[PDB]
Each structure stands twice: as C-alpha cells, then as structure tokens.
From Swiss-Prot, chain B:
Domain of life: Viruses
Compartments (UniProt record): Virion; Host nucleus
Protein name per UniProt: Major capsid protein
Portion of the parent chain present: 540 to 588 of 1370
Physiological role: Self-assembles to form an icosahedral capsid with a T=16 symmetry, about 200 nm in diameter, and consisting of 150 hexons and 12 pentons (total of 162 capsomers). Hexons form the edges and faces of the capsid and are each composed of six MCP molecules. In contrast, one penton is found at each of the 12 vertices. Eleven of the pentons are MCP pentamers, while the last vertex is occupied by the portal complex.
Subunit structure comment from the entry: Homomultimer. Makes the hexons and eleven out of twelve pentons. Interacts with triplex proteins 1/TRX1 and 2/TRX2; adjacent capsomers are linked together in groups of three by triplexes, heterotrimeric complexes composed of one molecule of TRX1 and two molecules of TRX2. Interacts with scaffold protein; this interaction allows efficient MCP transport to the host nucleus. Interacts with capsid vertex component 2/CVC2. Interacts with the small capsomere-interacting protein/SCP.
Similarity section: Belongs to the herpesviridae major capsid protein family.
C-alpha cells in the first residue's frame, strides 16, 4: 500500500473503471506515462505536443 | 392521503422513498429517460454497448 512511493497512483485505477473498450483508450494509458522533467518537457514541447 | 378506518376518516402520511414515486405531472416520463442519459454521460457510457 505505499501509494506515495509507488510509480502509478490512484488516478490510473479511477480512469480504468470508466474506460471505453476501444484501442484509443490503450494509447490514452500510454500517453499518461509521459514524464514530468526538464528534458522530457523540452523534448515533448519541441514536437509541439 | 385521507383514508377510512372503522367508519371514521383519518389522515395518512408516507415517505416518497424512491424518486419515481413523484406523479408525472411534476416529473414527466421523458424527463426521467433523459436524466438517465445524463447518468450515462457521467459514466462515459454515452452510447450503450
């Protein structure tokens, strides 16, 4: 139960319950994985994401 | 509601335990279906499976 030291917290389980079962949701889980960091931010925004 | 008891008239009161109990003059039938649609929209099942 170490949710604060865990890598993947409760917002993922809450989103999973209301999931529509189409492949678009899978990429939505994949998209949420984007990192919060300086290098990740600059690379992400340089693509205009 | 008024009611008869052993040849005398008395008053009677009960709780509206379910929202459906409301007479449709104060809550029409189509309103309940569209409220269910709002339920579905909150639950992301906007088109039913």
């Amino acid at each position: 139960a170490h949710e604060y030291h865990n890598w993947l917290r409760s917002p993922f389980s809450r989103y999973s319950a209301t999931c529509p079962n189409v492949l678009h949701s899978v990429m939505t889980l994949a998209a949420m994985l984007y990192k919060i960091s300086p290098v990740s931010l600059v690379l992400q925004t340089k693509a205009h994401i | 509601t008024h009611c008869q008891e052993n040849s005398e008239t008395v008053a009677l009161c009960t709780p509206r335990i379910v929202i459906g109990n409301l007479p449709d003059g104060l809550a029409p039938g189509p309103f309940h279906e569209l409220r269910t649609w709002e339920i579905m929209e909150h639950m992301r099942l906007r088109p039913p499976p």
